Amino acid sequence: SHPHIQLLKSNRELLVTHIRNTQCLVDNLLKNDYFSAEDAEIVCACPTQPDKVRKILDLVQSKGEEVSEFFLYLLQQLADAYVDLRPWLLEIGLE
């Protein structure tokens, strides 16, 4: 079976509505040779963040289980990277 692909296909709405930045995702997929320039360009053509997430998920899924697993670990990494600053960033406090 493909448990990581299934995770993406089964929780699409969560991902589509709750990823507010797709550039870090594309940049990392490019750097690690999972996305081509072509793939990034296709994602670029999608105007809105939700539309872009949909495209990214569609591409990742079609590339298969290993790319899907890599994507989920990337999300984990990114979600953890700056999370411990969240309290301070409210206190300072930015517009």
Place this chain on the structure above:
Amino acid sequence: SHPHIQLLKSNRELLVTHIRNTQCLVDNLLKNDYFSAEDAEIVCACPTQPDKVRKILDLVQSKGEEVSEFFLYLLQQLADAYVDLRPWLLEIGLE
């Protein structure tokens, strides 16, 4: 005065210990023409994440108030980008 520079210089330890990824930061500073290739290379030479954060802060600060403000808004943006996935990513559940 330089309130955003002061914010970086006064909360260095928080930032140095609680930023776990510097690549998104460098990538965005490069894309927006605040960092040169030279600057990225200098950050690259720092082995550990804490060492890299120190270097990034030093460079941002020396570039001045507007770059410091941009940096703080970047941290805000990045901290918000995937934060709403944090509960799900525990549930699934990755290594």
